[model samples]
Target: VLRTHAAGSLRPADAGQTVTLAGWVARRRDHGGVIFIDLRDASGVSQVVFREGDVLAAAHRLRAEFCVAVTGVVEVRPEGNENPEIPTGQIEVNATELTVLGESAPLPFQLDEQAGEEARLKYRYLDLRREGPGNALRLRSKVNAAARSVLAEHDFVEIETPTLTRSTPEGARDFLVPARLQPGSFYALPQSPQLFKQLLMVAGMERYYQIARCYRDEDFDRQPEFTQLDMEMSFVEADDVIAISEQVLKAVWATIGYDLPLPLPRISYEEAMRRFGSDKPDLRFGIELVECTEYFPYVGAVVMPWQEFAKQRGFFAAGPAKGARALLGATRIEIAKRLDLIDPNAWAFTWVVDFPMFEAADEATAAGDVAVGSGAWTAMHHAFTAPKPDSVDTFDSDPGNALSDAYDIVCNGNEIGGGSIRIHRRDIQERVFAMMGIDHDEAQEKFGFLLDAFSYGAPPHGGIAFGWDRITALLAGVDSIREVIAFPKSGGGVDPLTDAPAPITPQQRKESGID
Candidate 1:
């Protein structure tokens, strides 16, 4: 009701008409006899000028961040006064009436580069008024819409699952919610809808999808809560799931003007490790790790392109396989930056597939930690993943050599999505659980509901979960996912906005039995 036309929509051709524009006063200046105020809205920015009137007097009193609704006549700027960079620069409004809609106090920090991140987050409401973070969120909304549209068209039903769930000690760590009613009993937030989505398929849904919210008690490069693109389908193999995933992502990227390279390149898990020392390698440049030599041949070692470059420059440091590749992976990115080869605008996508079905729990793998179960064998993906056809019989004899029908999609060095074909047979499921050191009773205790559902007949199903926040951050050319979130926490998971993580009252703590 405040505006007839957005402040940014005016043009020189509409000079004869009167209009109403509403927004915040970005800046105000009194040019002696005249006044000029830059009005800003989510659409864009417009310059409003006041030549003479009580309106000019009112405009002169305007300050930064004073919200107002302006009634004005659209007019062209005087010749040679146009700003080509901004969309609404060629014309301005001659405001006649001014109404103060809202008023803001003196800002805690400036709206530009001078403001520190800490101060900006503390006043995030003000920060959202700025362009960078604001535009990123708007773009993220479009991305979410695109995903929903694509999934819906593919007959994927959007379903809601439980946020508060039972404790399933599977991945990373789960956030526990204290139960005031059940006393020592606690509820764990889901890491992903891994079990429930599979159950949906078993319930004859055929196709299911959810823009799921998950929680994890992870600190490094993670959030306490996050969004993911979750989907599962009945009677689908790895290729079927991969095709649908690629199509959904391609549609989303195209919505934002990025034409993703079709049929994204694929690499095996072993090849990726050999060439780039990373499963999710950044393929934007060429500085491959070369498999040159093994030890005892003149006491040599495997070499890499950057190592030679560093050796020539006398900055090379040698170590074991793990340490050396750790150094190589980092040097690869810097080499791309140093050589002017890192392109932020271009999109790179690849697939890493055929990961081992099970690995030795004694040593760490790509996930950095093998916290699968209490045994010598750990699942590279999860216990539900199905072993490859040829390797299904060898799990008992050669668990390390068995491969799984798993795949991961990497874009710009980030693992955007990951999933695998799951074992739908109850016997096979129990076998996988047993392999992970869980006996029949423990398997029932952990995922008995799923096994009960399986006994009634379950179909072959598979699904993938995409890190939606990370994808949006990549699309925005940003490193921190927090930049894309509206009210993100600091590195310590403290919300500077409301000064969160404050203490609970003693009586309230007593209700939940927290000491």
Candidate 2:
């Protein structure tokens, strides 16, 4: 019989009705001659009863997690036997026949809250049976559905981009696939489908969205492969993108019984650094960093006498006045105190915009302690990011002070998303590339197509990639994103269950011409 949500609605009034239900045995309990089993499927769970001499003998042997089909008569429990916890608790199936289609071995861990992470990931199938992961997945599905519906309503075409594409020069390393036919050549997996989606814009798609799978070769708590709701719209300004994204997130929250405040506050990058010492500040707490340059001189006088005596040799070379600089080390201690952040019941969201276009290479590199090629300065985000219109001239003359029209969406002290108004004009884009030390020929080779497309009247466009897994993890109140992802790689980037990243056989490697 088809599963229905009305399992609890069944009563003795339907006692004569024949029904077939299919699910795993959530649990089994035996009391002398009678058996009670809680059968669970994706829809929900219902209890089934089997009594000796009343049902087939095979039904008595069924165990927990056995996939089975039961043909039975629906009936209400005896008075005072109602179970209010489950939806179908008040009614149970009186099984007359049973068919066990599959069986499971004893699980490594109980499907309960106390299950450890290692064991849970080892037997993810069982872990997913528990309420937490299941709910996370359900919420994620709802989020996707809400986003798709909203995008469709706004005339955004959902498009699929190729997963295997040529790798560009910067950003995260790509997971490459070797080409057997081409001997040593490889195809790099798309890191974000950034180029392809932009190409779609150039192709006159106008508006496009993809719940795209992106692969990165970086090791992180979450798996290397994650999904993002990538979107781009032509002829739109920064505010346009932010408005649409806010609406999408608001709609998702509303559907899930959350009332998110509209018009999330925006903070500039410089302001964020000055106030919180972190671009993504957790607004739930009040330990903002305070610049103490003004108080450095008086810091030595504040330490306890005992602490001062312990350093009689002088923490600094001379007197308390000279010790002022040494005592200024309290900034580090104060920063540590501010890092004691915790808030389980609040959502802190903010935006950081107007970020620096580039950062100077570290001091060691400046001191010629490293090879020039390895130590050269790099784009803070990417070379395509547009310098703030007012700072355009500084791109060549004073790169350090130049800011970009970049923005980051921060939530609860994590950067959930980031984007920038791209350099749409060919000359600006090329000039930015040149300032990064890329020669004309090299720029033409790597980004020649994008420059060519720009010349064809590309509209000004910018978009953000929201970390779907990260957002879901935060919403589910999990400490790490791996908790919400099924089949996640371990912290070392290995798949324990599948034993991935293993060495290939010698002969197999030879076929691909690899050592």
Candidate 3:
């Protein structure tokens, strides 16, 4: 083998030991006749000294990113020569032999040079060698491990569901795949394992979990394919699902060295909207909204943090109540930044519950857009969410007023996870489909299997899906999810590295009959 010890693992304690290291040369510096090479690897970087004879000549030829192996004796660096920045600074390897494993061509860009995102992505293999992306990926691995460990401890069964399935409404849009074997028929990538996980619960698997791959024909800001920590449990209510979700999140946060407290604060959806104008409210700082609707009386009046509105001065509104709240909400976000009230290191975990069962079809809700089917109303959390017992009566009379036993996990203003107690009774499920404008035949067409399963022996169940990439981004303290994602798409959702989303040949198109 070309390697005996990791270059970064050398320390003062390793003094007097002979070691061999293999890695790409990160940097090379020559002090008159003496040469120092910083060997970089996944573990870290180590300083290697080369002087005299063939070893010195070999070090001279080692350019940046040149893969090489070196045999050396580890020794403590002389006083005043030690670097305080790195762990291996106090010790270095004095190479007696050197071998070039692989020679790289002249790089398009330097290792430390700042380049455009397009260029960085075009040469992502080189980009990943940088500190930020590399560390983020490593932290993401730790997060995944912690989550898996926690779920295992809870006796949850890790399961894999089909990637190709019948398209059922759950979210934004589905990525369709042509079925060449059965021309004119197509398979859709799942938005989540929503139905299959629920089916698992129906099959008597009390607890089911999966790191599921989901796809959507979304805009550029989002990825075509993303991941979620998907889970479902039988014989559970909102609280039961919340408890397990909290444990998994707590363990994930701990992987990044943060202790997330238990029983995260609960706030009703109405309360969150009324007070913060957002279901995912940032509790790190406080500037609670105040109502001044009495003064104007017509459209409404409120004191928003408008720049023109003097400090603490009242502002007037001339729109609907929801519009006023939204204006204030927008103002609240900017005010927080203006006042610098956010505590960067503080952890604010919140559980936003009691979301409305339905909203007017015309009104856009931040919860997420779903296929509204065909009525004047749309289900807020999908048709499966069980309505609160008290609100069940209002479904036909006052759909807007109806609430559900749904909950969302928010941290520092991001809605990281969401779930709801599902409708297990076939009657309730049927009624819900009707409410969403899905006629009897349409419901049968789309969800007939699920309805049939419910008639058998379905148990009360609920589950949550955590936005895995978002959580990793938050833990990595990065602004964009693309930063945490490996091989992320760029403009127009295209992968520049391999030039993906490429044009298919005429023969390929003929197979799927796209032509």
Candidate 4:
């Protein structure tokens, strides 16, 4: 056999077993007539020894990352020579043969050094060779498996959705592709499989889910492409979704040996804004925002034990009541870090619920802050989300006070997933589109497909979509999702390997009719 054992799999107990091992050379030490080489594989690293001979001569040519196969007998290291830091520390392979399989040029940067993130991404193949990216990917794989297991147990059928689909203007700009046959026509990459999944429900796939890829053209650090755990259910309510999602999450945490408490805490959107000043909140550390109504109007104190630190650090902010409190969300996080209150390795989940069903889509709030509201009316979740027991009278009378049956799963202050009971009735759906300023003509042009589909008695269905990249990143305990994502764009959003978003060729452009 070409190989019989991994470099790291050997121990003193395997002594005298002749085994073939293959991997990259990590380190080498040549003592005039004797030599030791640290061979590394995906499993781990081990030392190999050779004496003056053909094998020793072959080892001499080996440098860092020279891939080779070594046939040797495992032997215990000298009493004083064993290195305790590695798995194969107590043993060494006394080589009988060495054969070079590959060789590489000098690396762009030291793999374990304080390299720039861009530099690391540029050489991501090598970057992944390091333990951090490698293990994160390993953990992410387990997470995906665990999610599938949990969902499968709940009788959810996994399905695939199309990647080439229509442009969805409701969310982000399109990453477009011009059609060759239908000149001037284009298919937009899906922002999510929202329409298709809902259609799956309409087609009577009662329980459904998919690990789906989605894209966006708008600017962001996350991606032009990303994956989500897309799910939908028929004849389900908010309670059903919350229960199922909690179990999926519970299984994921168990896979990683962390205990995820069941029935995660719930917070209304208003309460979230009031207490932490954010819909997504980091509960790992708090300086939970506290209103100082006794002393000042529209002023908040991010509670900290050290009074001196709180005052000196100016853990305070003021604004109009409309958003002054919510604005403290960022300030609170910053103060938590400055005071060393945030825990780096902690997990917290909460449901940010009770989002308003409608908001001004184009008009500012009474406070006149455009940030507070520029839209005269729009759905807090989406037009498909149904309002709480509404028939449009509540919307027509007091839209601002209307609430949706929507919820978001927040983890460590990140909105990981969200969903709501959909507006299953065509009339309510049309009303929602109208409330969002979609005239009949505009509605017919944009969402007429879904509106028409609902005419065939679409069931009361709802679903959730979780950001797999963000969730995987969190499971890997990373602040940035980029590292956990393979072939991730540079922090500046450039793919070093392909230099994407490059100009199209003139001929290609002509074929696409952009010429």
Q: lDDT by residue for model 1 over 165-187, one digit each (tens)?
A: 87544466778888888877788
Name the regions of candidate 1 deviating beyond 4 angstroms: 294-324, 362-370, 513-515
Which candidate has the top score in lDDT?
Answer: 3
Tens digit per residue, CA lDDT, model 2, 1-515? 54433443555566657677887888888876788898877777778888756464776678768888877878888788788887676788888788787887776765655566676777777888887888878877887888899899999999999877776543566788887778888888887877777778889898889998888765356578888888888887788888888888877766657788989999987776655545666566554444444554322222211355336523221234323433333333333345654556667788788888876556324433221123245566667778888888777678878888888888877888877777778778777766657667877777788888888878877777788888778777787887777678777686766767788888898797543
| CA lDDT of every candidate | 0.82, 0.72, 0.84, 0.81
Model 3 C-alpha lDDT per residue in residues 304-409, reported as the tens digit of each score: 3465643443344445777667667666777788778788888898999989888776663343465557777777777788999898767767887888998999
**Order of the predicted models by TM-score, top scorer first:** 3, 4, 1, 2
| Each candidate structure's count of clashing pairs | 0, 0, 0, 10
What's the residue-level lDDT of 32 in candidate 1? 61
* Highest TM-score model number: 3
TM-scores vs. true structure, each candidate: 0.92, 0.86, 0.94, 0.92
Task: Say what the RMSD of model 2 is.
Answer: 5.7
With a 3 Å backbone cut-off (N, CA, C), the pairs that clash in candidate 4 are: 360-375, 360-376, 360-377, 361-375, 361-376, 361-377, 362-374, 362-375, 362-376, 363-376
Backbone clashes in candidate 1 total 0
Which segments of model 4 are wrong by more than 4 Å?
292-299, 306-316, 362-375, 390-392
